[PDB]
PDB file of C-alpha atoms in Angstrom:
ATOM      1  CA  UNK A   1     -62.325  -1.855 -22.034  1.00 41.64           C
ATOM      2  CA  UNK A   2     -61.092   0.626 -19.488  1.00 43.46           C
ATOM      3  CA  UNK A   3     -61.423  -1.792 -16.620  1.00 45.60           C
ATOM      4  CA  UNK A   4     -59.522  -4.645 -18.409  1.00 44.74           C
ATOM      5  CA  UNK A   5     -56.595  -1.942 -19.482  1.00 46.26           C
ATOM      6  CA  UNK A   6     -56.351  -0.627 -15.880  1.00 47.45           C
ATOM      7  CA  UNK A   7     -56.265  -3.844 -14.105  1.00 48.00           C
ATOM      8  CA  UNK A   8     -53.740  -5.364 -16.374  1.00 44.41           C
ATOM      9  CA  UNK A   9     -51.471  -2.289 -16.160  1.00 44.53           C
ATOM     10  CA  UNK A  10     -51.649  -2.404 -12.160  1.00 44.22           C
ATOM     11  CA  UNK A  11     -50.465  -5.947 -12.316  1.00 46.62           C
ATOM     12  CA  UNK A  12     -47.692  -5.084 -14.910  1.00 46.65           C
ATOM     13  CA  UNK A  13     -46.409  -2.267 -12.491  1.00 45.50           C
ATOM     14  CA  UNK A  14     -46.686  -4.547  -9.320  1.00 44.97           C
ATOM     15  CA  UNK A  15     -44.390  -6.908 -11.392  1.00 41.37           C
ATOM     16  CA  UNK A  16     -41.941  -4.423 -12.321  1.00 40.58           C
ATOM     17  CA  UNK A  17     -42.066  -3.278  -8.541  1.00 38.46           C
ATOM     18  CA  UNK A  18     -41.243  -7.057  -7.260  1.00 40.49           C
ATOM     19  CA  UNK A  19     -38.385  -7.528  -9.726  1.00 44.03           C
ATOM     20  CA  UNK A  20     -36.942  -4.171  -9.095  1.00 44.61           C
ATOM     21  CA  UNK A  21     -37.153  -4.906  -5.205  1.00 44.97           C
ATOM     22  CA  UNK A  22     -35.320  -7.779  -5.862  1.00 46.83           C
ATOM     23  CA  UNK A  23     -32.679  -6.270  -7.831  1.00 47.65           C
ATOM     24  CA  UNK A  24     -31.989  -3.996  -5.029  1.00 50.59           C
ATOM     25  CA  UNK A  25     -31.848  -6.809  -2.485  1.00 51.07           C
ATOM     26  CA  UNK A  26     -29.415  -8.677  -4.755  1.00 51.94           C
ATOM     27  CA  UNK A  27     -27.075  -5.737  -5.375  1.00 53.64           C
ATOM     28  CA  UNK A  28     -27.031  -4.928  -1.585  1.00 53.82           C
ATOM     29  CA  UNK A  29     -26.128  -8.406  -0.788  1.00 52.61           C
ATOM     30  CA  UNK A  30     -23.368  -8.484  -3.575  1.00 54.54           C
ATOM     31  CA  UNK A  31     -21.846  -5.265  -2.040  1.00 58.65           C
ATOM     32  CA  UNK A  32     -22.044  -6.573   1.545  1.00 60.85           C
ATOM     33  CA  UNK A  33     -20.237  -9.963   0.451  1.00 61.05           C
ATOM     34  CA  UNK A  34     -17.589  -8.038  -1.608  1.00 62.28           C
ATOM     35  CA  UNK A  35     -16.755  -5.997   1.378  1.00 64.38           C
ATOM     36  CA  UNK A  36     -16.556  -8.866   3.641  1.00 65.51           C
ATOM     37  CA  UNK A  37     -14.186 -10.584   1.390  1.00 66.39           C
ATOM     38  CA  UNK A  38     -12.048  -7.254   1.651  1.00 64.14           C
ATOM     39  CA  UNK A  39     -12.201  -7.457   5.335  1.00 63.05           C
ATOM     40  CA  UNK A  40     -11.076 -11.035   5.511  1.00 64.98           C
ATOM     41  CA  UNK A  41      -8.160 -10.151   2.981  1.00 65.03           C
ATOM     42  CA  UNK A  42      -6.843  -7.272   4.918  1.00 68.24           C
ATOM     43  CA  UNK A  43      -7.118  -9.043   8.212  1.00 72.10           C
ATOM     44  CA  UNK A  44      -5.182 -11.780   6.963  1.00 69.84           C
ATOM     45  CA  UNK A  45      -2.358  -9.738   5.652  1.00 67.85           C
ATOM     46  CA  UNK A  46      -2.310  -7.208   8.880  1.00 67.16           C
ATOM     47  CA  UNK A  47      -1.951 -10.499  10.839  1.00 68.61           C
ATOM     48  CA  UNK A  48       1.003 -11.716   8.493  1.00 68.60           C
ATOM     49  CA  UNK A  49       2.610  -8.468   8.874  1.00 67.07           C
ATOM     50  CA  UNK A  50       2.003  -8.212  12.531  1.00 67.49           C
ATOM     51  CA  UNK A  51       3.759 -11.863  12.816  1.00 69.12           C
ATOM     52  CA  UNK A  52       6.566 -10.583  10.726  1.00 69.34           C
ATOM     53  CA  UNK A  53       7.113  -7.487  13.096  1.00 68.88           C
ATOM     54  CA  UNK A  54       7.465  -9.751  16.111  1.00 69.73           C
ATOM     55  CA  UNK A  55      10.014 -11.948  14.513  1.00 70.79           C
ATOM     56  CA  UNK A  56      11.917  -8.787  13.713  1.00 70.16           C
ATOM     57  CA  UNK A  57      11.471  -7.416  17.372  1.00 69.60           C
ATOM     58  CA  UNK A  58      13.634 -10.505  18.362  1.00 68.51           C
ATOM     59  CA  UNK A  59      15.764 -11.302  15.389  1.00 70.55           C
TER      60      UNK A  59
ATOM     61  CA  UNK B   1      46.979  -1.853   9.420  1.00 73.25           C
ATOM     62  CA  UNK B   2      45.272  -5.444   9.746  1.00 70.00           C
ATOM     63  CA  UNK B   3      43.705  -4.409  13.126  1.00 71.46           C
ATOM     64  CA  UNK B   4      42.395  -0.635  12.128  1.00 72.42           C
ATOM     65  CA  UNK B   5      41.182  -1.958   8.832  1.00 73.24           C
ATOM     66  CA  UNK B   6      39.320  -4.982  10.505  1.00 75.21           C
ATOM     67  CA  UNK B   7      37.714  -2.739  13.365  1.00 73.28           C
ATOM     68  CA  UNK B   8      36.704  -0.124  10.991  1.00 74.54           C
ATOM     69  CA  UNK B   9      35.116  -3.012   8.399  1.00 73.56           C
ATOM     70  CA  UNK B  10      33.344  -4.263  11.554  1.00 71.46           C
ATOM     71  CA  UNK B  11      31.740  -1.099  12.572  1.00 73.25           C
ATOM     72  CA  UNK B  12      30.918  -0.403   9.213  1.00 68.26           C
ATOM     73  CA  UNK B  13      29.120  -3.673   8.747  1.00 69.55           C
ATOM     74  CA  UNK B  14      27.380  -3.091  12.242  1.00 65.78           C
ATOM     75  CA  UNK B  15      25.957   0.256  10.850  1.00 66.51           C
ATOM     76  CA  UNK B  16      24.427  -1.382   7.669  1.00 68.39           C
ATOM     77  CA  UNK B  17      22.862  -3.984   9.964  1.00 67.17           C
ATOM     78  CA  UNK B  18      21.258  -1.388  11.980  1.00 69.49           C
ATOM     79  CA  UNK B  19      20.178   0.755   8.837  1.00 71.45           C
ATOM     80  CA  UNK B  20      18.738  -2.424   7.280  1.00 70.60           C
ATOM     81  CA  UNK B  21      16.938  -3.724  10.658  1.00 73.73           C
ATOM     82  CA  UNK B  22      15.328  -0.111  10.800  1.00 70.04           C
ATOM     83  CA  UNK B  23      14.177  -0.379   7.090  1.00 69.47           C
ATOM     84  CA  UNK B  24      12.686  -3.923   7.967  1.00 69.17           C
ATOM     85  CA  UNK B  25      10.812  -2.422  10.892  1.00 69.75           C
ATOM     86  CA  UNK B  26       9.575   0.641   8.911  1.00 71.63           C
ATOM     87  CA  UNK B  27       8.193  -1.600   6.055  1.00 73.09           C
ATOM     88  CA  UNK B  28       6.590  -3.895   8.319  1.00 73.01           C
ATOM     89  CA  UNK B  29       4.827  -0.963  10.289  1.00 74.13           C
ATOM     90  CA  UNK B  30       3.789   0.841   6.903  1.00 73.26           C
ATOM     91  CA  UNK B  31       2.270  -2.780   5.499  1.00 72.57           C
ATOM     92  CA  UNK B  32       0.563  -2.962   8.902  1.00 73.96           C
ATOM     93  CA  UNK B  33      -1.037   0.587   8.646  1.00 72.86           C
ATOM     94  CA  UNK B  34      -2.025   0.163   4.959  1.00 74.43           C
ATOM     95  CA  UNK B  35      -3.937  -2.985   5.887  1.00 73.53           C
ATOM     96  CA  UNK B  36      -5.343  -1.311   8.992  1.00 72.38           C
ATOM     97  CA  UNK B  37      -6.874   1.339   6.987  1.00 71.69           C
ATOM     98  CA  UNK B  38      -8.341  -1.218   3.979  1.00 70.01           C
ATOM     99  CA  UNK B  39     -10.081  -2.651   7.120  1.00 73.90           C
ATOM    100  CA  UNK B  40     -11.470   0.563   8.177  1.00 73.54           C
ATOM    101  CA  UNK B  41     -12.554   1.200   4.830  1.00 72.57           C
ATOM    102  CA  UNK B  42     -14.296  -2.091   4.156  1.00 73.40           C
ATOM    103  CA  UNK B  43     -16.077  -2.279   7.697  1.00 75.41           C
ATOM    104  CA  UNK B  44     -17.559   1.238   6.720  1.00 74.50           C
ATOM    105  CA  UNK B  45     -19.021   0.197   3.327  1.00 74.23           C
ATOM    106  CA  UNK B  46     -19.943  -3.113   4.891  1.00 75.77           C
ATOM    107  CA  UNK B  47     -21.820  -1.034   7.484  1.00 76.97           C
ATOM    108  CA  UNK B  48     -23.514   1.358   4.973  1.00 74.64           C
ATOM    109  CA  UNK B  49     -24.604  -1.554   2.747  1.00 75.21           C
ATOM    110  CA  UNK B  50     -25.875  -3.473   5.732  1.00 72.83           C
ATOM    111  CA  UNK B  51     -28.215  -0.129   6.809  1.00 72.41           C
ATOM    112  CA  UNK B  52     -29.389  -0.019   3.165  1.00 75.21           C
ATOM    113  CA  UNK B  53     -30.546  -3.659   3.215  1.00 74.12           C
ATOM    114  CA  UNK B  54     -32.453  -3.124   6.389  1.00 78.97           C
ATOM    115  CA  UNK B  55     -33.936  -0.012   4.760  1.00 79.97           C
ATOM    116  CA  UNK B  56     -34.921  -2.235   2.120  1.00 77.66           C
ATOM    117  CA  UNK B  57     -36.249  -5.148   4.107  1.00 80.26           C
ATOM    118  CA  UNK B  58     -39.077  -2.578   5.058  1.00 80.73           C
ATOM    119  CA  UNK B  59     -39.348  -0.336   2.283  1.00 82.42           C
TER     120      UNK B  59
END
């Protein structure tokens, strides 16, 4: 009785560990991707503004 | 009378043109700088997230 309970509880803990490890990696990748998109957005608007500034420097 | 009125109106228009040109350059530079700051912020958080992901890939 002790054995089957202990073994089962070990496997159940292992399963939670694996799920939570996957959740951590998922959340990291999500945050990474959102920041990459923010960089693309800002570099884009920075370039638009750079070009407008250059067109002003003429007239 | 016509001359002094015309001359004065020309100079006044020139003055507005110069003020407005400066305003345009000011607004461009302001937008440029805000986007540069957004890039610095996001690259920073992207790097923090990258490092956390690497620390997960071990454990």
